[PDB]
Amino acid sequence: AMTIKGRAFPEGFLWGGAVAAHQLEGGYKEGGKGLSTADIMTLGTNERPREITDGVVAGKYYPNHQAIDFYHRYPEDIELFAEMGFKCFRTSIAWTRIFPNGDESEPNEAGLQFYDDLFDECLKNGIQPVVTLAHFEMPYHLVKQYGGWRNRKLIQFYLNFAKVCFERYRDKVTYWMTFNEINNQTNFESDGAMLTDSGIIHQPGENRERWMYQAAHYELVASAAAVQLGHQINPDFQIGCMIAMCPIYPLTAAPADVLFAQRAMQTRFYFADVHCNGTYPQWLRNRFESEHFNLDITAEDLKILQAGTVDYIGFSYYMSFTVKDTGKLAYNEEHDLVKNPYVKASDWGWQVDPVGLRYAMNWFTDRYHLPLFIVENGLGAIDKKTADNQIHDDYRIDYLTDHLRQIKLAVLEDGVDLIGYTPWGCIDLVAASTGQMSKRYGFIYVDENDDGSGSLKRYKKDSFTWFQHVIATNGAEIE
Amino acid sequence: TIKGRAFPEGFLWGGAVAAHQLEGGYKEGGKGLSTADIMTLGTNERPREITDGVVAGKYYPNHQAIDFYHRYPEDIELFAEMGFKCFRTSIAWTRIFPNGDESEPNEAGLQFYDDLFDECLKNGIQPVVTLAHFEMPYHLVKQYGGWRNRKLIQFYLNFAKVCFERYRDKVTYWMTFNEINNQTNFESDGAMLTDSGIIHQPGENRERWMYQAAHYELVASAAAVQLGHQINPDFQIGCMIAMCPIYPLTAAPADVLFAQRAMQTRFYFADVHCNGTYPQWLRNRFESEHFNLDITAEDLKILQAGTVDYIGFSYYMSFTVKDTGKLAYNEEHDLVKNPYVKAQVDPVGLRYAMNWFTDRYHLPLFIVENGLGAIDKKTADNQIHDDYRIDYLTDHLRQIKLAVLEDGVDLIGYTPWGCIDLVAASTGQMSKRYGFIYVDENDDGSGSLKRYKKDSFTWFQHVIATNGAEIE
Ligand SMILES: [Cl-]
Ligand SMILES: [Cl-]
Ligand SMILES: [Cl-]
Ligand SMILES: [Cl-]
């Protein structure tokens, strides 16, 4: 009876692609650019974690130094994006190109000039930049000198950075987001999440949980202040949060499983609660008191939080989680997740849950009643370039199709308000988890090996063509 | 731990009833015939017969009930001894407007509630009033088609205005429509009659007419919040929601999405009551099913300005669902057993439901129904040992206590259902008992109607006098 084929996405829908500066740009030293926390992360494997080193240690390979050299090649890459018909380009402004060490009193003109040029290049091509301010690339100086977001000073260092960007680019960007995947540090035991989100490398004697919430608080306050500041520079600016949206199912209908899963979602998405409601949920305030965290939270902080709630919720989606009741009060993401036996290998071997995206979209809408922006979704897989220089990546086409199907249902049937959709790593870039080029997400193949060798030549994948057609038909054919 | 910690200062402990389930005096003081007054006695496997007015030869248990209309002084004596802070009841619509469409209220019905409320207030017990509680005038059902008809909005408002004005110095908490979301089960004739005064006409699209009637009710609720706030700006005017949380049976993504939609369907009423607008998924449904409902721009403006001050709710059970394959939730066919709950009583769902309401709406809550229906036996020495009832209420109160003290849910009070044994809604039986007070009435209406304290009476007395501090 009901069908979605033949029906277009809404008019004005922002199809695009998504990246982060540190994962594609390279030129990590060009133009007086500072050493970021991305620049101290060595290459790893599927089995071997990336090494966080103290500065650039000698005889180690850092894949973010060159990446795919987009700092220099962006006009060629953007032409490929306009050939696909992108309506937007989601990327980050490297904090380290604008304030290399993060505490300077004036910005870096060479860095500001780069984004002028990059954005001018997008805009003459019909492509509006969608910009994330903090994206796992903060000045390492801030980590060494201040202890990262342990320190309330980062609130003003962040705002200096946002101010300069808001003003410089105020006729060039409409959509901004403050802190990429701010809620990864929900897993406070993940060294990767503490560094990327908050620039925290654990010190002996520290309560990891306590300092995550201290750090998240300051960032949430910084985000709220940036919304207000932002709206003052350009009232047309749409300013959003960025949430990693892994929904957490109860394993079974056992009441205690269902309650525990509620508390896991509450714990993982309190960040969104603050961004959107302007206040801390009361259960978490109660947790702050009963664990005696004694957090540095001022009455000024709370007023800023309540005036600086966001215009929309940008999120990533990749997977869903499952939990059963542990007997325990709190959700610890490192230890409490169980296997979901109802989700099995797809035709291509990897597990996905496209239904959870629909679920997630209804969960955001019914809770906050704000527009959403899907700014990260994609398949990381091995691609082979054939002798005749093609990549037949129908495993990537299927992946995106299965997800787009559910998104199309969420919007057309469920009536969820979606600004757009920008699949992750539209051009093959350095993967966050391992720093391998080999784990590829792109519509565009970049001839680079994991050791950084290769010509770096761009080639179209078959998915490039499939996605061009989707944009050209505004998603009408998706069934 | 929570052991030794009190509920918040001023927590409204009490008991709840509905005028039609306990008053009796169904023709007294010019009282009109209600929809409760046309329902015969039934059992578990035998629906209450609906009749067209009162037929001779049939027994109607609500006609007499437990005679609280004449016995309220004795009965309130027992509530005051138990130590109630509030008494949650309905004002019988047919006592104030017998046919429902009169231009003037009935002075004797109004004076009954003056007498009743003053009797409560002289003992430190504040009334908490639900305006529509399954007892609308049968004149409105018969001649207008109940809430199928837009004219009922004004009829409700004439009723509400009068009650707000008359009891302005005597009632702080009000609620508009009892369990407004029972009619989610649009295949349920009982739910349709009790919520919306709809006796089915063949040819009629049940679901469509539900949505239409529920719309006018939501509009009337919105408009009465504004009216009451104008009459006494210190009034708290809430909704009343039947909170049956719906669990996915397994973590299968299709089961999880279906449970989301099941709860979206069942609780959109709450969405409209609190958010002040229709959820977009449902509006889309109105379009794709071609309901062509009567919804004006003016309706949408009243709704948005008339959102409630708090959420009143009943809690008895949770439901479970698996994916059916279908696009829509049908509550008459789509529920499956929860194999993880003892043989569906579920105290932890209460805690869940409280967080759910709180995280979704961020409004204060009021638990206005909760309790255990059971066959109570009176011993030869006139004791009722309802240890099962104390266990049930303790299990629920413990979950309520965690929700409030740890989870920081904003709870106004707690009034268990049927604090004095009354006529059950499901069957019209006395023998399915909920009370702290046992009433000696058989299902055919015979007996002394004498009152006795069940063991739970003294238990709840001590819960109140310690403000829940021993609950662990
Ligand atoms: Cl998954
Ligand atoms: Cl990274
Ligand atoms: Cl659905
Ligand atoms: Cl929610």
Residue numbers in the entry:
A (entry chain A): 0 to 478
B (entry chain B): 2 to 344, 350 to 478
Q: What did the study's authors say about this model?
A:
Specifically, the β-­glycosidic bond of 6′-P-β-glucoside is cleaved by 6-P-β-glucosidase (6PβGlu; EC 3.2.1.86), releasing 6-P-β-glucose (BG6; glycon), an important cellular precursor, and the remaining portion of the given substrate (aglycon). Here, the high-resolution crystal structures of GH1 6-P-β-glucosidases from Lactobacillus plantarum (LpPbg1) and Streptococcus mutans (SmBgl) and their complexes with ligands are reported. 6PβGlu is a single-domain protein that adopts a (β/α)8-barrel (TIM-barrel) structure, which is a typical fold of GH1-family members.
The LpPbg1 structure has been determined in an apo form as well as in a complex with phosphate and a glucose molecule corresponding to the aglycon molecule. The apo form of LpPbg1 was solved in the trigonal space group P31 with six protein chains in the asymmetric unit, 547 water molecules, one glycerol molecule and six chloride ions. The refined atomic model included residues Ala0–Glu478 of chains A and D, Thr2–Ala334 and Gln350–Glu478 of chain B, Thr2–Asp346 and Gly348–Glu478 of chain C, Met1–Leu42, Arg49–Ala344 and Gln350–Glu478 of chain E and Met1–Thr44, Pro48–Lys343 and Gln350–Glu478 of chain F. The crystals are merohedrally twinned with twin operator k, h, −l and a refined twin fraction of 0.28. Superposition of LpPbg1 with apo LpPbg1 yields an r.m.s.d. of between 0.42 and 0.65 Å (for chains B and F, respectively).
